[PDB]
Design a protein around this ligand. Structure first.
Ligand code: MXN
Lengths: 104, 104
């Protein structure tokens, strides 16, 4: 099994209310109840320069697991994912996304 | 209780042999055999633009888990970690690191 990790770092645009940002994050997490392929969704906020100062302006991280590349692609091209991407990406001031096959 | 995820994205300097890059990554993974603190270390290489095209020149991801911020900071300033930092950070063309508590 070639398990894929999907890790997103972002920074939200400064004009968005915290209410709007909370909603976007809730919507992201709720994709797991629509897309059976998306596993182990988690997120959090960077702890800041008291812990380490290499976040380069990124504030949030999101992690997802997929059990194959084929499962990831089916998810990524599904209508719910395409719809969510049109809300999520324009809300980002900064974004970076890596997809990788897990090595132990 | 507050478990911390430590996620690193990097890109290596172009002058390094792949042999040395391989060694650097092996040295990184081996920190968990010295460090009780660093757990569940995994890594991989970005899957490229046929999968998704938002990696922004980052090629590698590394993930690990710490029991607490206290444990992370004891780890990060320990002698093995400081020795590894001397080879790792100068080998990075660029790097971004987020540390966060998990939300689900
Ligand atoms: N940031 C980061 C890497 O995880 C790291 C770098 C140097 C020493 C220990 C760990």
């Amino acid at each position: 099994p070639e398990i894929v990790r999907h890790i997103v770092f972002n920074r939200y645009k400064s004009q968005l209310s915290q209410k709007q940002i909370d909603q976007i994050i809730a919507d992201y997490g709720n994709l797991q109840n629509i897309a059976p392929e998306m596993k182990e969704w988690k997120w959090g906020t960077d702890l800041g320069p008291a812990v380490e100062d290499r976040a380069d302006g990124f504030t949030h991280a999101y992690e997802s697991t997929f059990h194959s590349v084929a499962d990831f692609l089916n998810f990524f091209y599904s209508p719910p994912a395409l719809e969510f991407a049109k809300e999520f990406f324009p809300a980002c001031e900064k974004i970076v996304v890596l997809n990788y096959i897990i090595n132990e």
